[PDB]
Amino acid sequence: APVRSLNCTLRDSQQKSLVMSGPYELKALHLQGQDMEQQVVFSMSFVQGEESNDKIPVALGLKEKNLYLSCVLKDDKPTLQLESVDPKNYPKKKMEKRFVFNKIEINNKLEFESAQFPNWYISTSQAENMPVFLGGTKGGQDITDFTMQFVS
Ligand SMILES: NC(=O)c1cnc(C(F)(F)F)nc1
């Protein structure tokens, strides 16, 4: 049947919100009050892929935009990008692998691993107003843990 999707926001474990930073760029910053309207709302689709109790394959599209987070090699490195798609054809249950993240629940937090690039994760910096990026460890100074908020 159709693909099932939920509207949501994400915040990193330091409670930074995600906003735009150009036509295809996301940054993370501390946000509260009026400025919270600036945060990106995702449509999280539950897609085809290997699945277990705590590891759920999803795609992350921007709400009512034909833009998806994707993982590709750029200048020979696994990188995160926002990629446009044909709005007639998306979302779909069989999303291409570059669009698929494994949403992993550990200790009441979420990690989003690239399905395409094992052990590469959606990451934020500790500094304010820096890009969201794909980081090659769920270790170290960069942040790989998030919480989800459900949106109407
Ligand atoms: N400048 C970056 O490292 C960067 C990568 N990826 C993104 C995305 F896809 F979240 F929007 N925004 C910025």
From Swiss-Prot:
A motif (Involved in interaction with TMED10 C-terminus) lies at residues 112-125. Keywords: Cytokine, Cytoplasm, Inflammatory response, Lysosome, Mitogen, Pyrogen, Secreted. (Microbial infection) Cleavage by S.pyogenes cysteine protease SpeB promotes its activation independently of CASP1. SpeB-mediated maturation of IL1B plays a dual role depending on infection site: while IL1B inflammatory response prevents bacterial growth during invasive skin infections, it promotes streptococcal infection of the nasopharynx by disrupting colonization resistance mediated by the microbiota. Changing K63E: Suppression of integrin binding. Markedly reduced activity. Activation of the IL1B precursor involves a CASP1-catalyzed proteolytic cleavage. Processing and secretion are temporarily associated. (Microbial infection) Cleavage by S.pyogenes cysteine protease SpeB promotes its activation independently of CASP1. Changing E128K: Increased affinity for integrin ITGAV:ITGB3. Suppression of integrin binding. Suppression of integrin binding. Changing K65E: Suppression of integrin binding. Markedly reduced activity. The keyword Secreted applies. Changing K55E: Suppression of integrin binding. Markedly reduced activity. Its main location: cytoplasm. Induction: By LPS. Transcription and translation induced by M.tuberculosis and a number of different M.tuberculosis components in macrophages; EsxA is the most potent activator tested (at protein level). In pancreatic islets, release is increased by high glucose treatment. In pancreatic islets and macrophages, release is also increased by endocannabinoid anandamide/AEA. Monomer. In its precursor form, weakly interacts with full-length MEFV; the mature cytokine does not interact at all. Interacts with integrins ITGAV:ITGBV and ITGA5:ITGB1; integrin-binding is required for IL1B signaling. Interacts with cargo receptor TMED10; the interaction is direct and is required for the secretion of IL1B mature form. Interacts with HSP90AB1; the interaction facilitates cargo translocation into the ERGIC. Interacts with HSP90B1; the interaction facilitates cargo translocation into the ERGIC. The IL1B production occurs in 2 steps, each being controlled by different stimuli. First, inflammatory signals, such as LPS, stimulate the synthesis and promote the accumulation of cytosolic stores of pro-IL1B (priming). Then additional signals are required for inflammasome assembly, leading to CASP1 activation, pro-IL1B processing and eventually secretion of the active cytokine. IL1B processing and secretion are temporarily associated. Belongs to the IL-1 family. This is Interleukin-1 beta. It comes from Homo sapiens. The chain holds residues 117 to 268 of 269 of the full protein.
